[model samples]
Target: GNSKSGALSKEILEELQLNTKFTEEELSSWYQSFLKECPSGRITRQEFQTIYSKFFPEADPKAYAQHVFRSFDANSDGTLDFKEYVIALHMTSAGKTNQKLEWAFSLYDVDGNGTISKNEVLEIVTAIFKMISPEDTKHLPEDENTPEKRAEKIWGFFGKKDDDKLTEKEFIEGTLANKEILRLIQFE
Candidate 1:
């Protein structure tokens, strides 16, 4: 009992996700990958429930979908357009990935000026490493197990030869280049 206005299909959502043929090469790449992997972009309201279930095995998909749909229906029209869907996608992914976009932005706003700086990039990389450090620690135990060793392991990802700061481009494109990571930031 789904209404056309309220429901977006997997194909349509996929079209939005894989919408290439645009000027932005990155957007094109996103579209290509999304289309290839998620052919049916238009994941119906019901389908999101299934997808969510895969990601959140312990949660109830129906309740999750309801919560998700409500948030995306920004106009209160009860339907989600491509733009609206994108917002939900980002929020959903940010929640799933520890690297939440809002948190990153807030932390990156160095100088407290509400602007992201190269130094901010450093902070982001630093944060990501720490966020994922527990796993890294588990893989290889060290004899020292000191605070410095723990800090070093997490910082290793960004501590390339004498590098102190990361450029904005590097932070956005380089560090977050992984497909799944990109997906986490996407809206649709």
Candidate 2:
């Protein structure tokens, strides 16, 4: 039957139930395509970059793509398999607010160490800023755009002290409450 039925975990199935449906045939088809490049059922970070870089051939999107890839690699493994990819796509595309917020948190938590250090937040923010045109950033105050300042601005929203690192709870609660920081992290 070529069906990959029952492959999705209970949690994934429950999550998907809230939004849409994927038939066994559809899942099988997508899984086939997903594995076409690397039939080992997983994609290394390098392979991920190779695939995503095609979207920004004229510029370097490694930092941004790496951020996204880390979010999708839910198990914190260096590789992504079919299930991880599907879950990430679903969550980022049409999942609930909390799901999206959690996904964005993971993106900024580059080290996957359960806490987002000031440096980590700055790194992702700087990467996002690089994707924009200079004209967009030119009029902005120089101090405000610096990585340190940006990190501080975001952390400040969480009510955490400047020297404090943000745990997932702090990150989620802060971003969810403050629209400005939510937009900064691209969770809005």
lDDT of 2 by residue, 1-188 (tens): 13423233223334532322445456455545666656565777666666545533444655333454544433546665643453344333434455555544554443446676776677556544543445666766564566567767887777568767777678788877887776666521
Candidate 2 is scored at a TM of 0.45
Best candidate, lDDT = 2
| Local distance difference test values of all predictions, in order | 0.37, 0.54
What is candidate 1's local distance difference test score?
Answer: 0.37
Worst 10 residues of 1 by lDDT: 1-10
Model 1 / residue 103 / CA error / Å: 11
> TM-score for every candidate vs. truth?
0.27, 0.45
Model 1 CA deviation exceeding 4 Å by range = 1-34, 37-40, 63-65, 73-98, 101-188
lDDT of 1 by residue, 1-188 (tens): 11221122222322333322223333434443543575334445554555455534444555433444554333433233332344344333323232344334422332333444334333333333233335454654353244344333323443343335444344345336544334322221
Worst 10 residues of 2 by lDDT: 1-10
